[PDB]
UniProtKB/TrEMBL annotation:
<feature type="disulfide bond">
    <location>
        <begin position="65"/>
        <end position="78"/>
    </location>
</feature>
<feature type="disulfide bond">
    <location>
        <begin position="2"/>
        <end position="15"/>
    </location>
</feature>
<protein>
    <submittedName>
        <fullName>Thermal hysteresis protein</fullName>
    </submittedName>
</protein>
<feature type="disulfide bond">
    <location>
        <begin position="60"/>
        <end position="83"/>
    </location>
</feature>
<keyword id="KW-0732">Signal</keyword>
<feature type="disulfide bond">
    <location>
        <begin position="23"/>
        <end position="35"/>
    </location>
</feature>
């Protein structure tokens, strides 16, 4: 259930009901998320969208957010904890 287009994930990462486009996922749990040209390093992201962003943990947890160029959009439904973002 992982749509992968030119993306690579660490053998240890998990991808469920998500789309990866030119994305790099390392030690991460991506659920019902859309990934576009972003880098996931030690993160658990749910029901979100990442565009051209680098997000790192290792204790990074993201829930229902939209991330673009490293900046998370203001959203009452966007919950972030222990994450460090950057442009990708």
């Amino acid at each position: 259930s992982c749509t992968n287009t030119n993306s690579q994930l660490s053998a240890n990462s998990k991808c469920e009901k998500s789309t990866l486009t030119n994305c790099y996922v390392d030690k991460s749990e991506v659920f019902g998320t859309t990934c576009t040209g972003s880098r996931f390093d030690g993160v658990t992201i749910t029901t979100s969208t990442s565009t051209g962003s680098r997000i790192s943990g290792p204790g990074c947890k993201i829930s229902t957010c939209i991330i673009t160029g490293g900046v998370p959009a203001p959203s009452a439904a966007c919950k972030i904890s222990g994450c460090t973002f950057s442009a990708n």
